[PDB]
Amino acid sequence: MMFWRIFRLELRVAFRHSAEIANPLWFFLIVITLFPLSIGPEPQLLARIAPGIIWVAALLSSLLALERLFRDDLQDGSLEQLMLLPLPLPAVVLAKVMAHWMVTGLPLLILSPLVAMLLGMDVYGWQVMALTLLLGTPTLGFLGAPGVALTVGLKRGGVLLSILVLPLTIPLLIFATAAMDAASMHLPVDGYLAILGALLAGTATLSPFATAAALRISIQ
Amino acid sequence: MMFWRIFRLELRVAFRHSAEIANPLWFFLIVITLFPLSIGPEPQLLARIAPGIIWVAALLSSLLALERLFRDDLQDGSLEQLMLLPLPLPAVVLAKVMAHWMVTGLPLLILSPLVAMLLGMDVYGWQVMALTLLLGTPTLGFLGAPGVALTVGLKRGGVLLSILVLPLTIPLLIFATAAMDAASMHLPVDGYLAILGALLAGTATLSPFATAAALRISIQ
Amino acid sequence: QLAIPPRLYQICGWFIPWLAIASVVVLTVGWIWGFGFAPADYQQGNSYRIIYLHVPAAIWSMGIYASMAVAAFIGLVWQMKMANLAVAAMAPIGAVFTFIALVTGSAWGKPMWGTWWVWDARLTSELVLLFLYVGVIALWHAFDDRRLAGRAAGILVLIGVVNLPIIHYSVEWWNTLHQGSTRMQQSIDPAMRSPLRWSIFGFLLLSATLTLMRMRNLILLMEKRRPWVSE
Amino acid sequence: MGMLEARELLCERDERTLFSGLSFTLNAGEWVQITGSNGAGKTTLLRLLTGLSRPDAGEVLWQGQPLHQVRDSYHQNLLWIGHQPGIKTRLTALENLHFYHRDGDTAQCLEALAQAGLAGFEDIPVNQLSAGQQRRVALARLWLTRATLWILDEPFTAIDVNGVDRLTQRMAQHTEQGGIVILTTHQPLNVAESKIRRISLT
Amino acid sequence: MGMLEARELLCERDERTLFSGLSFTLNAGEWVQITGSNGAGKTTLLRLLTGLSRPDAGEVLWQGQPLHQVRDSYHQNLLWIGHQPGIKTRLTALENLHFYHRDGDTAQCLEALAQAGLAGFEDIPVNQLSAGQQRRVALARLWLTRATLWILDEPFTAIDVNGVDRLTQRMAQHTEQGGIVILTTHQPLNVAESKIRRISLT
Amino acid sequence: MTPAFASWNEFFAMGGYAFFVWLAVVMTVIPLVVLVVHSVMQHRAILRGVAQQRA
Ligand code: HEM
Ligand SMILES: Nc1ncnc2c1ncn2[C@@H]1O[C@H](COP(=O)(O)OP(=O)(O)OP(=O)(O)O)[C@@H](O)[C@H]1O
Ligand SMILES: [Mg+2]
């Protein structure tokens, strides 16, 4: 109830001080800088391997931040939402997922101008990387929300349970890499962005429903 | 009370903790598969970027595997070793971190031959693979133990750990990837091997004392 | 004959005016005697004037990291409570110095490389030092309970300083493997030495100012509940 | 006709069924307490009444209609605090209640805190409360909420007797007006027996 | 005489002063219990006795020596069971306690646990055992340890009186030979009142 | 008494590479003043921070 005050709540719980907001920024920066230490300093090498670097960093951030989205609540705050808030469970879980993005995607997007200069990306490359990144990163919380809830709240879970979390994100990253490679080659990519645009408008509609049902089943 | 007793019991409780130890392994597999799939059919660049991608994969897998090192100890059994076992605490930490390597580092070692087939390395390449991984992963665990020892009290498993120890692992990454690059050029790598061994020996002594002090502080 | 009581709050109060005004005077004399009263090199042209503004930041980054090392070393073995507090006082000052050195080095290198980013030993090392800083700040801000952030922070500082020369010599050696050497040798020239040293001293003294204010703030934040703070 | 009604509830854990065929209807103005003990059915009996879990065989109808069918007119009249109060430990006591309250006008929030024994603990983070005041924050809602239903588990698990006493006398108060009170207490209640209707897991 | 003794011990947490300048002799042949309220720092006190926590000021001496100096031989004579049991949950009972056996294991384990009341549960992992029985496995170390110091932190949380009396006898049959049982409890001990030397957080 | 510039901002503020040097000056002055004002203001807030605690 009052979607935005929930939003303010999970804004407050995750962050404690004005100094510690940029923690995901520092994670992104160290993950990116790990590669030129190992791959090499040559720009052309680092130029062409940009998509893997950037979306691997995004994948790491998403996986690290999804565990905290649900596992901690099991001990203390998993309920009081399935049990209160007469508003539909899809609404509150959508709030959780979108704030999960806005504490991870927003730092990554706002950091994109810097990282593109580290890897030698050009303005067109930065533009396509930013527009795809803002178009695909929110989805990472969408499909990951049902998977993480089961793996952190279902006991006697086998190895096959994690297959609904990590490998389901492969299509997103492969389309992202292919699209921004095509853009890096200086080609129009609008059709690829439409595919990303199509999946974002579609997954956002069905993700909260399945996630709410998954939490309902998992708490029992 | 003896090194071997704590070693074997930590190993045993590691065997009982299946299905999350594979998560570093599954992550390693997926990350080493993205980049060859990210770049189309052109092997010369793949040979050039193979050591970097696989070693950053090794770093990330080490962090994910090390995240559990002290997680399930503070609530139950971080003590009973500071408090009991008249054997000095640094020895206990040393035994437990060797067990952690044995349950985590060794699976990486046995996973190399499949990786080499995928990445098209040669027999000398796999030889140096094993040599650097066998002398790199123990350094990873030894250097990562202080970070988890410090952050165990927080019980915030995630971004914070990944920025406290990962910047410490830079020289290991540089020397490992440089050795593996030089190996593909068929130059002798004995001096690089000696440098890696010296780094492991140096971190073999400071890390136990540092983690002992860190745990003694974190309990309070 | 150390006392180290909360009375050190008064000690900090007894230094801020004098030392701060001395710092502002020396900085302004360095930056007017530099940045407009000294010539430049033949090659880089007038852009060489970044030296007065770029080198001291880098130098004092390492200087106050050494200060971190000594303060934490005192605070751990002797169990000095305030000595462990010095870490948090100098942490964001270090972060700012190293960030400034990074941005200047990148900005100074634009004419000679043509690009805003060059992965050289000098810049890359500064990135790792900044990372050690931001790790220290993050660790200190992670602890809700004080009196712990400063002991764990001290241990982190010790781990950093032990590994710092290894990392720096590795990255210096890493650069040799790819490019081979630096651009050109180091020539300060007698006509361009005194202003640089005076700017070094000015950054020293402004760092001292900021450390003292942060010590005072941390003293208040820690001993916030004792009736000593009734004022 | 009337609010929540049990309808041959059946549930089971492991090998022992906690109860069998509960069907009891409750109307307005009842203070009631579950007897027996709390081994497994502690949360089980209450969660099924709230619709949090689905029954192995049975159902409960709120106001004559299925709980999951509406899911709206039932949640609006309900409060619950149990083994885990469901309030986040990060926030302070004052702000944590503000979201829970329907608007958080702040003109009465501190009043609830004051009447809950949490005088002056408004701006302190709730994690800094020593051992029991955290439940007091959750129990502070009951001064402000307009809901007519209360499902509560261990409401006096660590509450002091004076704190317990204030909580009890407020429960009987609204039951006189329109309310209902169900409690699962190991500590005996210091109230007249006729004001409590008791039932166990059978 | 005087193997356990603290010097002007005091600790400060936030605004509240738990205690100031604690100092008291603790020699062999005593049976010691700690009194206090649920907000008092009794748990903080006990953990401080075992050297896990560095005191805010003051110190404790083992036999007259600072604990960190004699930390090696100190762990020879001490047994500690806190609020957290300290036992591996996914590891079975018989082999969990097997760690704490210097010798005579795999056969002497059974006798002690059966007295605690875990006969027939030697080869079951902890996570399929009840919490009350779960505590007993940790307490089973009492019959087997040769340590002179038994430090129990609320060892009667959910333990049956038949177990409690059996446990109480165990620490009643240990101190007279020279043993020491530093205890904290909320149940009124059902033993001779002169056997308890009470200390409060003064 | 010996300037290094023949004249003022007609010659000054344009060293040929003025764009690089001047952005460096601003991007260095900002962090120092931000730290100073942050420390002083946060100290001042603590000083008020006592006040509402005394109520
Ligand atoms: C272009 C980017 C540059 C960056 C990022 C940079 C950074 C640094 C760093 C990290 C130091 C510390 C060295 C030490 O403490 O031993 C330093 C000092 C110094 N730099 Fe640079 N520098 C740059 C350009 C240059 C150039 C082109 C020269 C040419 C001579 C130069 C000359 C010096 C000298 C003489 C020192 C003093 C060495 C010392 O104090 O030990 N710098 N600078
Ligand atoms: N991190 C902390 N954890 C626990 N107590 C703290 C902490 N920081 C400060 N304190 C204060 O120190 C005191 C220590 O009390 P302690 O935790 O020993 O209570 P306790 O007797 O263990 O409670 P219980 O009997 O319910 O376990 C508390 O009153 C608390 O207010
Ligand atoms: Mg306690």
XYZ file of C-alpha atoms in Angstrom, chain C:
231
model
C 54.577 11.941 28.659
C 51.462 11.256 26.588
C 48.050 11.948 28.116
C 45.683 11.068 25.208
C 42.464 12.011 27.062
C 39.360 13.676 25.597
C 41.331 16.810 26.477
C 43.005 16.266 23.092
C 39.843 17.881 21.729
C 41.152 21.091 23.279
C 44.575 20.323 21.794
C 43.025 20.197 18.325
C 41.174 23.410 19.131
C 44.502 25.047 19.987
C 46.063 24.326 16.574
C 43.409 24.944 13.908
C 43.731 28.760 13.462
C 47.523 29.022 13.294
C 48.177 25.931 11.214
C 45.245 26.567 8.864
C 46.276 30.158 8.140
C 49.873 29.056 7.603
C 48.600 26.418 5.166
C 46.518 28.907 3.196
C 49.429 31.368 3.032
C 51.921 28.777 1.815
C 49.462 27.350 -0.714
C 48.627 30.752 -2.174
C 52.290 31.773 -2.343
C 53.136 28.500 -4.082
C 50.244 28.784 -6.534
C 50.953 32.428 -7.400
C 54.732 32.024 -7.533
C 53.804 28.967 -9.537
C 50.996 28.950 -12.087
C 52.030 32.316 -13.493
C 55.476 33.298 -12.229
C 57.540 30.362 -13.381
C 58.504 29.357 -16.936
C 57.689 26.014 -18.555
C 59.531 23.310 -20.454
C 60.434 23.470 -24.133
C 58.420 20.415 -25.183
C 55.125 20.395 -23.271
C 54.743 24.167 -23.444
C 52.736 26.080 -20.863
C 50.765 22.940 -19.956
C 53.719 21.792 -17.831
C 52.375 23.935 -14.957
C 50.258 20.962 -13.829
C 53.322 19.716 -11.930
C 52.743 22.084 -8.994
C 49.126 20.907 -8.768
C 49.560 17.229 -9.677
C 52.785 15.949 -8.090
C 52.104 17.041 -4.465
C 48.754 15.239 -4.399
C 50.403 11.998 -5.500
C 53.295 12.424 -3.065
C 51.082 13.069 -0.068
C 48.790 10.179 -0.972
C 51.703 7.842 -0.235
C 52.794 10.034 2.670
C 49.499 9.761 4.499
C 49.240 6.076 3.635
C 52.509 5.742 5.546
C 50.812 7.779 8.268
C 48.001 5.207 8.180
C 50.573 2.458 8.603
C 52.319 4.029 11.584
C 49.074 5.066 13.299
C 47.471 1.636 12.968
C 50.710 -0.073 14.008
C 50.722 2.032 17.172
C 47.024 1.396 17.754
C 47.145 -2.392 17.480
C 50.116 -3.596 19.521
C 49.922 -0.913 22.219
C 46.088 -0.952 22.145
C 45.955 2.838 21.860
C 42.293 3.714 21.376
C 42.730 7.077 19.631
C 45.558 5.772 17.446
C 43.012 3.472 15.812
C 40.774 6.520 15.345
C 43.386 8.259 13.177
C 42.636 5.803 10.365
C 39.113 7.090 9.762
C 40.309 10.682 10.102
C 42.796 10.363 7.249
C 40.787 7.890 5.140
C 38.670 10.303 3.038
C 41.508 12.831 2.931
C 43.582 10.104 1.322
C 40.751 9.220 -1.037
C 40.472 12.842 -2.135
C 44.224 13.299 -2.588
C 44.497 10.169 -4.713
C 41.391 11.067 -6.734
C 42.890 14.490 -7.434
C 46.213 12.938 -8.423
C 44.390 10.537 -10.744
C 42.378 13.245 -12.473
C 45.404 15.524 -12.870
C 47.611 12.759 -14.248
C 44.911 11.863 -16.753
C 44.444 15.535 -17.636
C 48.188 16.194 -17.871
C 48.687 13.248 -20.223
C 46.178 14.391 -22.834
C 48.615 16.463 -24.981
C 51.258 13.734 -25.174
C 49.050 10.669 -25.693
C 46.003 12.309 -27.261
C 43.674 10.260 -25.047
C 42.218 10.804 -21.590
C 43.249 7.353 -20.318
C 46.633 5.626 -20.490
C 47.287 2.427 -18.534
C 50.723 3.301 -17.203
C 52.398 2.278 -13.964
C 51.969 5.692 -12.328
C 48.225 5.947 -12.942
C 47.445 2.269 -12.365
C 49.280 2.298 -9.034
C 47.262 5.336 -7.967
C 44.102 3.412 -8.831
C 45.104 0.564 -6.515
C 46.019 2.988 -3.725
C 42.637 4.685 -4.137
C 41.067 1.236 -3.972
C 42.836 0.518 -0.689
C 41.512 3.831 0.625
C 37.912 3.290 -0.446
C 38.092 -0.205 1.014
C 39.203 1.261 4.341
C 36.371 3.812 4.309
C 33.825 1.150 3.358
C 35.025 -1.135 6.148
C 34.864 1.656 8.719
C 31.391 2.757 7.622
C 30.240 -0.874 7.644
C 30.413 -1.170 11.448
C 27.408 0.246 13.279
C 29.296 -0.078 16.573
C 32.263 2.250 16.949
C 35.505 1.232 18.687
C 35.548 -1.678 16.229
C 35.913 0.320 13.017
C 39.516 1.297 13.641
C 40.740 -2.037 14.924
C 39.542 -4.005 11.910
C 40.351 -0.894 9.887
C 43.829 -0.944 11.406
C 44.314 -4.579 10.420
C 43.154 -3.734 6.898
C 45.664 -0.873 6.766
C 48.445 -3.222 7.863
C 47.472 -5.740 5.182
C 47.457 -2.971 2.595
C 50.832 -1.539 3.553
C 52.480 -4.967 3.622
C 51.170 -5.725 0.128
C 51.526 -2.200 -1.290
C 55.224 -2.314 -2.329
C 54.649 -5.737 -3.891
C 51.735 -4.455 -5.971
C 53.586 -1.294 -6.994
C 56.739 -3.134 -8.046
C 54.615 -5.702 -9.882
C 52.739 -3.082 -11.901
C 56.033 -1.299 -12.582
C 57.376 -4.633 -13.804
C 54.115 -5.262 -15.673
C 54.566 -2.050 -17.656
C 58.065 -3.091 -18.735
C 56.672 -6.319 -20.186
C 54.320 -4.480 -22.565
C 55.801 -1.087 -23.499
C 59.296 -1.195 -22.019
C 60.178 2.138 -20.414
C 58.960 5.617 -19.518
C 58.744 8.587 -21.879
C 61.788 10.657 -20.891
C 64.033 11.206 -17.882
C 63.283 13.386 -14.853
C 64.559 16.975 -14.967
C 63.149 19.383 -12.388
C 65.628 22.185 -13.271
C 66.838 24.645 -10.599
C 64.521 27.439 -11.761
C 61.542 25.128 -11.140
C 62.333 23.413 -7.819
C 61.562 25.810 -4.951
C 57.906 26.463 -5.942
C 57.282 22.731 -6.229
C 58.741 22.056 -2.781
C 56.719 24.884 -1.267
C 53.554 23.452 -2.818
C 54.511 20.070 -1.348
C 54.718 21.683 2.087
C 51.430 23.503 1.556
C 49.616 20.277 0.757
C 51.297 18.763 3.817
C 49.873 21.466 6.032
C 46.380 21.446 4.517
C 46.375 17.682 5.027
C 47.278 18.372 8.649
C 44.352 20.797 8.900
C 41.869 18.298 7.516
C 43.193 15.484 9.702
C 42.760 17.659 12.788
C 39.184 18.603 11.894
C 38.342 14.961 11.236
C 39.924 13.943 14.553
C 37.783 16.532 16.325
C 34.647 15.314 14.544
C 35.402 11.664 15.307
C 36.106 12.504 18.952
C 32.688 14.131 19.201
C 30.976 11.240 17.416
C 32.604 8.642 19.666
C 32.434 10.420 23.032
C 29.021 11.880 22.202
C 27.217 10.486 25.266
C 29.634 11.294 28.093
C 28.592 14.329 30.185
C 31.894 15.903 29.118
C 30.035 17.164 26.029
C 27.443 19.157 28.017
C 28.476 22.306 26.121
